[PDB]
Design a protein around this ligand. Structure first.
Ligand SMILES: Nc1ncnc2c1ncn2[C@@H]1O[C@H](COP(=O)(O)OP(=O)(O)OP(=O)(O)O)[C@@H](O)[C@H]1O
Ligand SMILES: Nc1ncnc2c1ncn2[C@@H]1O[C@H](COP(=O)(O)OP(=O)(O)OP(=O)(O)O)[C@@H](O)[C@H]1O
Ligand SMILES: Nc1ncnc2c1ncn2[C@@H]1O[C@H](COP(=O)(O)OP(=O)(O)OP(=O)(O)O)[C@@H](O)[C@H]1O
Ligand SMILES: Nc1ncnc2c1ncn2[C@@H]1O[C@H](COP(=O)(O)OP(=O)(O)OP(=O)(O)O)[C@@H](O)[C@H]1O
Ligand SMILES: [Mg+2]
Ligand SMILES: [Mg+2]
Ligand SMILES: [Mg+2]
Ligand SMILES: [Mg+2]
Lengths: 387, 388, 399, 399
């Protein structure tokens, strides 16, 4: 018994969005934050969607390296010289949005098992369940992202993993086991999915009109599972194995400087690939997936030293910023997985394309789900008694 | 976001079910209604699912014909003579449930592309009006418009009712419906989007009783409601079920009313794929034998008459209608359930082969969990058109 | 622990065959004339085999196989002794180079002759009261009842009894129903094995035969190839010690009480087997009727081995005679003069089992069915067929 | 004519097997739950098998099979007698309900006890030697490729028959030298005539598929009344016209080998378990490995229980065999100063080649199954020939 919106997604906010764009229509103070870059792309969403496989915001990638030039990333199937494009297809080097603020436009060529002691510990060989532990429904396997606790209601303690790992269609309930479901091997029952989110409109997720398409949604796939009534929550640790103690979530501020997210180093620990490291390359990837529907996904990561950042089954690991000042590493997202048709991007000519990985903004996901992540075992036992 | 139960399905309502069976634990007062048959089957559900392909309630089937004997139907893969069964596998002819009430138990052999007529063409866009039986398509699947309904609570907008997995996908953030074809495949008018749908409902809120001892028991209630779009001409919507005529209001399936008013009755439906077909109710409350650790129920079981299959793929959403036996308006009692994959039959006589049976959803109960009231006349339609 | 022959299938007895044919055509010559007199005509199956065997090199030269019987002309079986030669696609004489066309007459050893005609040749369920009764809905087991191993379904041929040893009573079905290779035991159930449904345990396969050389089966050298075998697949299962034999009947439902086996004599006149009407009752297609069309069907494969099959049946009134799963049914001669119907074979099941052949041009291709000589199989397995319920209890006791 | 038992594998020896378990009541009064005398620790494979057999009821409880040998701890073989229990995925004790956790010690009848270990379990090469083994060499020996008209394999050893004519031949496992469509099984090196050049080696005179546990080991190795040993092996005598002078007994890449080392169930454990073995095969050349277990148990899909004798894993992370090595002679490395002796032949194939997890720093590793040569040579009545001179003696002693 679900409910979509009744008539408020057609000609009350469909022309209300066209009003924000219907109204507002050279050395000038170039864009400083993601908030500026997103608006520039949104205004030009017609000529940018005209020939592209998708767009994103970040820094311009020049001769294989990330620059310090704020730019809108435009993805194409095959990058060719300017000599093989009819004039309708070539893109300008610079765009101007509302209010004179500007940015660059560069082209990026784009397309849509490990064995270690740590991988075994995450797959049931350890004596504790935490971030990185394998979590499985009756069909698919995944990764437990983070220990969270509910804000309203019972204030029940549970964990957070992304959608399509913990939810299937034919089954009427979604039970989760570690490390295997009973129909496949041994495992302990963790609980069931109480509430999860699939799609959120851009204005409620980002706060702005990230596009002119009246049907624009955000791939915010994330699920919350409260620990079962008869489950021993004392076997849960908050130590991110292989990383250590982590801090609280740093929200992705659209107004802070660009290079505080773009280019920063991130790492994760996953069920399938252990501890891998990567670099954030873009933000707010736009659909260019023709159905008339516009989809967004927040984080885009690429692995370091040409090694892939994730594998199939890592869906649900915690995307964690590596410590730059000896502080506690703080998470900003959780790795999203799907659909498994995997996709590459081309950086250099002496090497082939490299696998990129998408993620969901943790700061925004924890808010629309009303959850607070637990960072130490002492603060955990507090929420255990609040139940 | 969604909202599933927090701790209310494990050892709060699991002991309320375990109590109903913990507490309870011939010669005249035989079962009279579906409620009696369901309780007897539920109490003996442990020793019944032990060797069976499924169970259902209804009348005993002897030599291919429905008798007047209330009985619990037990489905097997292949029926053999009593001489080849060890006594642990043979089933008793009579069961006695709680309170001395009893009933019979008989065995039924059981197992789990388009017609061409002027009526089928009218349903696929050749007519000048959209109604029950008209083809409704998303960008992926085809279906059948079941009935014109209107929402009771909230606003009062008029729309139509079709079953789920025609109107719902997982990837889309909205599900648009078109007649007779989606824009990406041919011509068509926009009908609207799916406002709400239900997939599974627990037995205790659906029937009102504990139909089984399995703590995880659900009802395959796949059905969706679509409000007509702002730019759609609601004047092209008719309430006449083509091939049947003007229909009455929903006949609710009362578990307490006498058996022979539903079991055995003659039924018909009009669908996108097979037009106007006739059939017979054979059982009720068919349970799962589907090995997911889950116990699934389906309310109506229909078999086509004169050896011809009752439905085909694409009929999903058709209105199951009781034929008029006294002269009143024919009344709907169910809507055809989807799936139609895995193609499963039942064997009635030995001189003829198996026949295809069709699943349905109880219309009277589904219209309440979706908060809808069916409209049967054009004047009653124009009322809801202005009541918006 | 299986056992093949010792060295006796290479040289010695192998050349023993070569000699029997090396004797002839060192010592056998027609005179001049090719207007051969009609007293030397082939009269029996044995005569036709000797002509075919001697001429096997030119017969398997361009052919899909050969067989002996009556000439088939314009869709009707005649009473003319002939060697049937099978081809892939039959064409007019004008499109054949002289090396491929076949002579109308062959002259075998001793002047004996016969005709040669050409036939173009190639290699889902019923619903009736009888088929259900045969598949476990009846209260008695007999001929035609469904018998199943853990993989495949079949048909019980006949109630038989062993000659030597304990003399235990059992039933007869063909090998490809009752034998698989992964399993170390062969359990048989009616109508279904426990891993598929309900059923009663009938017993296990005690003893079966797969291939027999032509000289041990027929008694003659039916071909010049030293590696020549007969597809004699048949298996014997004794009823279990704890089985209730009181539910076993010998009445072939739809046929009645049958007589004793009529052995196929290679020397008797042709028309006592060729052309005779036969019928069977099977698990998969019930009671169908057909007609014997040939005998000793020969087929050489791309490995150098020569295979034989005894009976060739085609269904009557263009209805197919059998379906897949009918493997093991009893081929019974219909009673012509009020006498007891007698069985002559059992339906064989395999890869070269259900091919098609074209008889008339106004009708499509028709399915032929293979069989094994019942009289000869009962000797290789040392079994005697039981025909009445009283004759059963007599044999039930002597274990 | 095929044969199987009549009433002796059904309640003759099924109560005889149930008897063994029932002169084993053990008192209905238990041991003391503290210490145990170390004179009762398992010393031989025979002791380990009986302990495993008695507890077979609780061992099938959430496990896919068992075997006997030494405990494998943190990736290394110890010398501690233990019963290996195979699981689908090994997990911590914290995720097991008490019905699934396994005891560290088991005590059998008569006080004998042992450890219980857990193992995670699941069910070509180009070199100068491999070319010589595949027809580029001028001599036939152990390791040379042997092929039927369908499949390729590896010649195990030059053997001679014990009874009868006493004919010289070679030994390979059954699924390499035996097919079921063919009525004969011809062997060629290196290719059959339908695929390439090759010389005719001979035909299969005898083969074995399954042997009951009581006749194979000498004891009742399990509680299941239907228990068999996968003893697939076939014997081919050299053809009548074949040149046996090109046959050598020198195992190329190993050297001259000694006589067969019989697997004594009563001798000390560590003389088989843990010993180093090597083989030369058609598909993977000369590889070396380590014996890891014995008497591998498996129940599938009916009441029927299958056993396999030898379990080997390759050394230094290299796989021990590949497909096509089926039939190679597995030889333990040199008896300390003497000549290496063979103990088995690689079975190879359908389900008998799976993986097992040893360390977390490495992925899974391929294990290879084998059958006891000492026991296989007895059911087939064959004697292994070890030198070229001893071969020429029996060649003319043939009858
Ligand atoms: N629609 C298009 N489809 C394909 N290729 C295009 C399209 N528009 C532009 N290009 C190509 O992309 C080039 C622009 O590359 P870009 O802006 O990324 O350069 P850069 O960042 O300075 O350096 P580099 O490409 O070495 O990283 C154009 O010169 C042209 O060849
Ligand atoms: N578990 C079972 N599996 C298969 N067949 C069974 C099983 N239990 C009983 N039977 C068969 O079902 C028969 C009884 O069938 P049933 O109860 O349907 O009889 P009925 O309704 O009086 O008549 P009819 O056969 O016409 O339906 C038994 O005689 C037995 O042969
Ligand atoms: N090698 C061959 N391949 C194909 N067709 C052949 C071959 N040899 C002969 N034929 C054809 O077969 C014909 C002989 O047919 P056959 O002996 O069956 O005649 P029939 O019995 O008198 O009549 P009918 O053709 O009506 O049965 C030849 O006329 C020729 O067309
Ligand atoms: N049924 C079972 N399925 C899966 N795992 C099991 C089962 N029973 C026990 N285990 C696991 O197997 C472990 C025993 O491991 P094992 O006997 O191999 O120990 P070890 O040899 O001392 O050390 P190591 O595990 O490093 O080889 C138990 O601690 C438990 O985690
Ligand atoms: Mg660039
Ligand atoms: Mg009945
Ligand atoms: Mg002819
Ligand atoms: Mg260990």
């Amino acid at each position: 018994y679900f409910l979509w919106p009744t008539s408020n997604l057609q000609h009350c906010a469909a022309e209300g969005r066209a009003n924000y764009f219907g109204n507002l229509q050279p050395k000038g103070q170039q864009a400083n934050s993601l908030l500026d870059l997103m608006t520039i792309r949104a205004f030009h969403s017609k000529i940018l969607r005209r020939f592209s496989l998708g767009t994103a915001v970040g820094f311009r990638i020049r001769k294989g390296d990330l620059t310090d030039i704020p730019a809108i990333l435009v993805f194409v199937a095959r990058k060719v010289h300017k000599k093989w494009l009819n004039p309708a297809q070539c893109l300008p080097a610079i765009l101007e949005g509302p209010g004179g603020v500007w940015c660059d436009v560069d082209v990026v060529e784009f397309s849509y098992q490990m064995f270690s002691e740590l991988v075994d510990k995450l797959c049931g060989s350890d004596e504790c369940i935490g971030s990185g532990s394998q979590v499985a429904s009756h069909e698919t396997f995944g990764t437990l992202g983070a220990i969270v606790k509910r804000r309203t209601g019972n204030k029940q303690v549970g964990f957070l993993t992304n959608r399509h790992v913990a939810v299937d269609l034919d089954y009427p309930n979604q039970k989760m086991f570690h490390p295997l479901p009973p129909n496949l091997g041994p495992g302990v029952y963790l609980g069931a999915v109480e509430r999860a989110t699939s799609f959120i409109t851009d204005d409620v997720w980002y706060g702005i009109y990230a596009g002119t398409n009246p049907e624009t949604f955000v791939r915010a796939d994330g699920a919350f599972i409260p620990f079962a009534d008869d489950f021993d929550i004392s076997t849960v640790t908050t130590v991110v194995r292989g990383v250590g103690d982590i801090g609280d979530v740093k929200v992705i501020d659209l107004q802070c400087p660009l290079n505080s997210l773009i280019g920063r180093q991130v790492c994760k620990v996953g069920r399938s690939s252990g501890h891998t490291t990567g670099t954030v390359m873009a933000y707010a990837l736009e659909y260019n997936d023709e159905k008339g529907i516009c989809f967004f996904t927040d984080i885009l990561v690429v692995g370091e030293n040409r090694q892939t950042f994730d594998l199939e089954g890592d869906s649900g690991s915690l995307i964690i910023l590596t410590s730059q000042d000896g502080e506690k590493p703080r998470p900003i997202g959780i790795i999203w997985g799907g659909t498994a048709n995997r996709g590459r991007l081309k950086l250099t000519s002496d090497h082939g394309p490299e696998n990129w990985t998408s993620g969901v903004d943790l700061g925004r996901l924890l808010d629309r789900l009303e959850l607070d992540i637990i960072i130490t075992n002492e603060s955990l036992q507090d929420a255990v008694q609040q139940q």
